[PDB]
Amino acid sequence: MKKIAVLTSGGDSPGMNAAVRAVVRTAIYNEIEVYGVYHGYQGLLNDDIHKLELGSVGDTIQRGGTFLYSARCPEFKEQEVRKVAIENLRKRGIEGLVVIGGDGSYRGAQRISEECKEIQTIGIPGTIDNDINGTDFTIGFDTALNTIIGLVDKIRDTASSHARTFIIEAMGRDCGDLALWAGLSVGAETIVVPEVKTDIKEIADKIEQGIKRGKKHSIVLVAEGCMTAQDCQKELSQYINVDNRVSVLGHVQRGGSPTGADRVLASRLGGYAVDLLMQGETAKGVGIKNNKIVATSFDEIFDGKDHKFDYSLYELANKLS
Amino acid sequence: MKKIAVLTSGGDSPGMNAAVRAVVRTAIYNEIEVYGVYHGYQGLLNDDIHKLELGSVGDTIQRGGTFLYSARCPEFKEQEVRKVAIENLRKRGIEGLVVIGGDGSYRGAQRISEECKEIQTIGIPGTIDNDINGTDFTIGFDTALNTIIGLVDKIRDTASSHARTFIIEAMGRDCGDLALWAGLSVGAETIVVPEVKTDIKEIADKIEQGIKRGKKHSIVLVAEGCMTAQDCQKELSQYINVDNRVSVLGHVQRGGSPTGADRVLASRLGGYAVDLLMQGETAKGVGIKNNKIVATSFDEIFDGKDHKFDYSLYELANKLS
Ligand SMILES: Nc1ncnc2c1ncn2[C@@H]1O[C@H](COP(=O)(O)OP(=O)(O)OP(=O)(O)O)[C@@H](O)[C@H]1O
Numbered sequence: 001m002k003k004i005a006v007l008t009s010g011g012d013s014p015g016m017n018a019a020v021r022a023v024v025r026t027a028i029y030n031e032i033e034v035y036g037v038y039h040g041y042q043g044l045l046n047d048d049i050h051k052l053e054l055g056s057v058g059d060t061i062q063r064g065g066t067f068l069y070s071a072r073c074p075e076f077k078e079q080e081v082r083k084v085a086i087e088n089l090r091k092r093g094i095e096g097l098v099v100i101g102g103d104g105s106y107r108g109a110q111r112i113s114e115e116c117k118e119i120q121t122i123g124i125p126g127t128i129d130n131d132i133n134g135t136d137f138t139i140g141f142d143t144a145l146n147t148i149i150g151l152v153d154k155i156r157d158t159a160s161s162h163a164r165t166f167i168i169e170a171m172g173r174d175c176g177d178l179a180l181w182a183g184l185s186v187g188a189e190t191i192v193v194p195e196v197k198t199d200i201k202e203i204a205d206k207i208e209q210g211i212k213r214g215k216k217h218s219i220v221l222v223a224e225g226c227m228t229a230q231d232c233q234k235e236l237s238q239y240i241n242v243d244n245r246v247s248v249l250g251h252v253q254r255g256g257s258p259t260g261a262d263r264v265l266a267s268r269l270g271g272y273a274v275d276l277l278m279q280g281e282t283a284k285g286v287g288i289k290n291n292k293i294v295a296t297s298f299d300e301i302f303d304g305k306d307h308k309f310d311y312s313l314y315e316l317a318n319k320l321s
Numbered sequence: 322m323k324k325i326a327v328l329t330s331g332g333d334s335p336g337m338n339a340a341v342r343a344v345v346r347t348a349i350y351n352e353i354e355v356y357g358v359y360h361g362y363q364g365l366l367n368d369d370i371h372k373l374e375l376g377s378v379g380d381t382i383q384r385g386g387t388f389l390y391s392a393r394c395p396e397f398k399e400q401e402v403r404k405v406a407i408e409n410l411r412k413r414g415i416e417g418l419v420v421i422g423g424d425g426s427y428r429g430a431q432r433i434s435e436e437c438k439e440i441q442t443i444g445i446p447g448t449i450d451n452d453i454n455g456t457d458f459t460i461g462f463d464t465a466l467n468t469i470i471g472l473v474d475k476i477r478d479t480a481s482s483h484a485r486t487f488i489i490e491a492m493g494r495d496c497g498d499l500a501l502w503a504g505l506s507v508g509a510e511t512i513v514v515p516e517v518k519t520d521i522k523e524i525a526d527k528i529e530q531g532i533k534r535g536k537k538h539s540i541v542l543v544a545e546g547c548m549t550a551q552d553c554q555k556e557l558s559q560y561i562n563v564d565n566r567v568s569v570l571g572h573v574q575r576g577g578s579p580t581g582a583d584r585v586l587a588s589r590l591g592g593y594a595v596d597l598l599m600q601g602e603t604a605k606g607v608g609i610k611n612n613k614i615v616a617t618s619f620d621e622i623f624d625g626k627d628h629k630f631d632y633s634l635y636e637l638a639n640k641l642s
Pocket residue numbers: 009010011041071072073074076077101102103104105106107108111127129173
């Protein structure tokens with residue numbers, strides 16, 4: 001395991017830089033040469049691959065986004081296109097590839113492993129969505145969660161006296177976890193998520209209570225995968241009067257410095273990915289499951305497509321509201 | 322389980338308010354009456370016990386410290402003094418007591434359970450130190466961790482150009498966890514903790530490298546349980562020249578709004594404490610162990626006095642630096 005490459009792919013998540021830092025520093029500590037691949041899979045295709053030194057990752061643990069960049073590379077779904085990527089790594093004697101991103105990003109690594117025996121691939125879960133098999137949490141979830149809390153605080157601090165209701169669109173893609181944790185965290189009366197059948201009427205009866213009971217600043221937190229904040233507002237206005245504050249939180253949820261949880265998590269998983277390459281492993285995603293650092297085959301990641309939504313926690317949040 | 326009391330004891334930790342909120346709201350949801358005990362165990366002694374309603378805990382999930390207060394009550398180590406506490410609860414028909422605090426606080430609950438069969442007691446781990454058997458994390462640790470990161474950022478942002486070295490005293494009491502996670506999180510070259518034998522010389526050779534290599538802003542993170550920042554500075558100055566920036570972070574580490582992790586953790590543990598009282602349980606601390614919400618008898622909490630320091634993570638941090 002003489003040389004490894006590392007790349008970041010998909011949307012930004014806080015702690016991607018901390019994961020690259022840990023890959024680079026662990027590899028060099030073990031006398032392995034490490035190459036940064038810039039712009040995700042497009043970088044592999046364009047040969048935008050450069051040797052990293054210890055100082056290349058100075059001042060990065062705190063840095064949001066990804067200093068290697070990321071780009072979309074739809075053409076990487078083509079087998080013939082991947083041959084070009086494989087040859088650019090092989091050219092350089094690279095024996096290991098670490099991909100930091102979401103499950104989409106993992107598919108690319110799985111293909112590279114199937115199509116080149118000589119390259120070992122390991123996935124690191126960098127995404128704010130928390131929707132990757134075999135890890136309880138993804139690198140960015142904790143940071144995203146706190147970003148939502150701060151945004152909701154800013155909204156409330158800047159709102160008018162008439163604001164009876166704030167409808168806040170959180171990210172998540174198809175997973176309700178972010179909306180649920182953020183919702184609980186901000187004391188939301190309602191949390192709208194894809195895993196629970198939304199009862200608009202029930203929700204409207206709940207706003208009209210707080211209001212009738214002379215209560216201000218009620219929060220509806222909405223996962224983008226269920227519906228848009230706008231849509232939620234339009235649907236509630238079928239029953240009750242509202243256009244309070246429809247706030248689409250948007251891409252800021254991916255920005256900002258990672259939290260300490262993300263820094264630590266990223267770091268452990270980046271070092272473990274390198275340990276796994278040195279151990280001869282391939283075609284695995286790393287994670288934290290039941291408080292243990294573990295590796296799961298991409299097959300299992302993508303087959304069992306089951307990481308439980310916590311209905312008990314959803315019901316607690318409602319209980320608390 | 323008709324009536325319960327809740328109290329906060331020991332030093333502040335972020336999320337104490339969120340835990341009280343969850344106790345109060347869960348109890349009322351289940352048609353249990355709930356009494357707030359003000360000023361910790363002194364409140365029990367002075368009968369500073371008041372009925373809480375749903376609105377008594379509005380605007381609290383985000384609030385730092387503890388709205389019931391806390392006080393030191395050394396006299397609660399006396400059995401005769403505790404009889405007064407027990408009678409003030411018994412007077413009111415209280416059948417359950419929830420104590421939010423550290424292991425010291427738990428001792429008081431253990432005694433109340435031994436000395437009054439009629440009161441069930443449950444402990445919730447509110448402390449920034451992370452030093453309580455049977456939970457992997459305590460309510461406040463995550464918040465404290467991020468507070469340290471922000472303080473270190475402020476120090477670096479405000480420091481002079483000559484600052485080659487920042488010696489930063491973190492809290493923790495006798496546990497090195499905070500120093501370790503914070504140290505990793507800020508990219509500290511050295512982390513000084515009670516669980517590792519400190520080699521001052523080695524540390525001095527490491528500062529004098531960065532400096533000789535024209536490198537600025539090196540961080541030594543010091544657990545208060547190992548030594549003071551001042552002492553660390555005095556000990557290093559036996560070998561090399563330094564008085565850079567000895568910063569004692571202090572009690573601010575206990576202040577501030579809890580993070581989302583703390584809010585959620587507090588909330589789940591507060592609701593679980595109430596579930597346990599309704600189930601007939603007593604003399605247990607609640608926690609999160611291997612990603613499961615669990616309850617541990619006070620005997621085990623205080624006997625096995627073993628919650629592993631993660632040497633592998635300590636060694637990773639050094640690897641990354
Ligand atoms: N099935 C696939 N085969 C090969 N490459 C893929 C596949 N799916 C995605 N990719 C590569 O991964 C890149 C990142 O994809 P995506 O936008 O899905 O990000 P992600 O955050 O990794 O995935 P997710 O939506 O699951 O969070 C794509 O632009 C593409 O180069």
